[PDB]
């Protein structure tokens, strides 16, 4: 007997993903976490922890 997730993971293009998906021909995955790396807190070296 093992443990595991009961459902799939959702990915919805709601929010600021939708503006770049309509205006340009592209769309991120997790725009919000991708934005907090660049502009909210720059020059931070990647660390797995």
């Amino acid at each position: 007997a093992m443990s595991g997730p009961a459902a799939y993971a959702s990915y919805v293009v709601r929010g600021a993903n939708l503006v770049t998906a309509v205006s340009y021909g592209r769309a991120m995955r997790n725009f919000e976490q991708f934005m907090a790396r660049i502009v909210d807190h720059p020059n931070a070296l990647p660390s797995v922890e």
Binding site: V12, V13, G15, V22
Partner: protein, 49 residues
């Protein structure tokens, strides 16, 4: 108006004038795409829809 010269007298007159309407027609043509008429009825799926 009568007067005292040698001119003939004037009997009373009557004028009868007939006027009628004129018909006019107007037409404009609109095209609507078949996909545009269709997806007004298709169901909501996602925020990009």
């Amino acid at each position: 108006i009568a007067h005292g010269d040698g001119r003939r007298p004037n009997k009373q007159r009557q004028y009868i004038v007939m006027k009628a309407c004129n018909k006019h027609h107007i037409g404009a043509e609109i095209e609507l795409a078949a996909a545009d008429i269709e997806l007004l009825f298709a169901e909501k799926e996602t925020p990009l829809d």
